[PDB]
Amino acid sequence: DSLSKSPENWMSKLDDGKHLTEINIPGSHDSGSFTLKDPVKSVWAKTQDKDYLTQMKSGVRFFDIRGRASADNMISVHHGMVYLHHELGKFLDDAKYYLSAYPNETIVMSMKKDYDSDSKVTKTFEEIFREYYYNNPQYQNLFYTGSNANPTLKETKGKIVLFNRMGGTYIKSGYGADTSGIQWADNATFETKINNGSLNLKVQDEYKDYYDKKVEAVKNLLAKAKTDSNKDNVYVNFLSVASGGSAFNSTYYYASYINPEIAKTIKANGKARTGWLIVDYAGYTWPGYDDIVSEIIDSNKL
Ligand SMILES: C[N+](C)(C)CCO
Ligand SMILES: C[N+](C)(C)CCO
Numbered sequence: 255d256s257l258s259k260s261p262e263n264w265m266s267k268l269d270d271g272k273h274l275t276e277i278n279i280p281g282s283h284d285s286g287s288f289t290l291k292d293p294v295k296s297v298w299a300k301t302q303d304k305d306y307l308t309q310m311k312s313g314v315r316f317f318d319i320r321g322r323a324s325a326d327n328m329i330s331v332h333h334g335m336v337y338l339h340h341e342l343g344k345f346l347d348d349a350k351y352y353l354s355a356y357p358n359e360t361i362v363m364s365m366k367k368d369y370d371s372d373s374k375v376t377k378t379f380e381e382i383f384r385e386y387y388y389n390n391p392q393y394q395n396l397f398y399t400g401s402n403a404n405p406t407l408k409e410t411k412g413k414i415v416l417f418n419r420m421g422g423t424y425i426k427s428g429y430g431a432d433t434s435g436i437q438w439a440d441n442a443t444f445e446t447k448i449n450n451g452s453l454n455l456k457v458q459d460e461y462k463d464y465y466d467k468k469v470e471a472v473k474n475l476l477a478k479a480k481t482d483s484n485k486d487n488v489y490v491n492f493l494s495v496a497s498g499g500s501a502f503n504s505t506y507y508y509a510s511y512i513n514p515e516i517a518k519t520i521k522a523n524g525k526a527r528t529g530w531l532i533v534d535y536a537g538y539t540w541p542g543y544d545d546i547v548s549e550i551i552d553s554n555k556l
């Protein structure tokens with residue numbers, strides 16, 4: 255059986271000497287938005303319909319968590335201004351539960367501030383995450399705390415590895431975990447060195463593209479990863495794209511074309527390096543069309 259037939263424990267089937275950068279990982283864009291039920295606001299603000307545990311059982315291993323500091327000890331999960339009905343502990347609790355059940359998987363968790371803090375807040379978003387989550391005794395043992403800037407599956411499995419979008423941080427473990435953080439370009443394909451030049455991050459995050467330009471941008475970075483065997487290069491390729499507003503195409507509309515187009519491309523490439531591909535409506539299938547999460551999983555060599 256191919257790896258995608260067992261998406262709950264697909265990492266457990268790989269050689270754990272691989273660096274995570276070398277694994278082809280499916281991620282979900284604005285992971286926590288599955289809570290939204292308002293159909294007007296959902297056109298533009300909603301990007302998933304499966305909850306965190308269901309995304310995990312479906313093979314998603316990179317979670318894009320964007321937040322707003324709602325109290326000096328709390329980060330709320332957001333899509334910009336839009337509150338997603340939960341705080342960050344809910345994601346961490348679900349991740350902890352999953353990684354205990356499937357201990358040979360690793361989760362990569364991106365953390366970004368997506369909106370200004372509540373007026374009562376006195377601490378920076380980075381301070382709050384560092385002191386009330388990362389260093390919270392409650393999450394002892396949950397996070398990758400090692401000092402390798404390019405960690406392997408063996409040393410990260412069972413744990414969450416921080417992918418730091420917060421800017422400079424005093425946290426010392428995970429991608430971008432130094433006082434420079436990651437220099438991220440708005441609406442662009444870009445490359446930037448992270449972890450004190452230890453890694454070359456290559457991102458396609460042109461989130462305001464229209465359809466044909468977005469497919470072009472995804473396939474261009476997909477083609478670069480295919481010929482790049484350098485373990486010190488890390489590829490993050492967002493398939494997700496913004497709606498132009500409620501009267502325009504929904505994010506689901508675009509996902510419904512992009513996901514199968516890119517899934518078709520990957521499958522026709524066979525077992526080639528893709529990088530980490532971040533998608534809307536992860537696990538959403540359309541009869542007759544290739545499933546992007548399954549095809550990213552099956553692209554991994556055994
Ligand atoms: C979604 N289509 C491929 C039909 C057109 C692009 O906007
Ligand atoms: C018909 N779908 C939108 C499901 C796939 C298009 O390519």
Ligand SMILES: [Cl-]
Pocket residue numbers: 377378379380
């Ligand atoms: Cl801040």
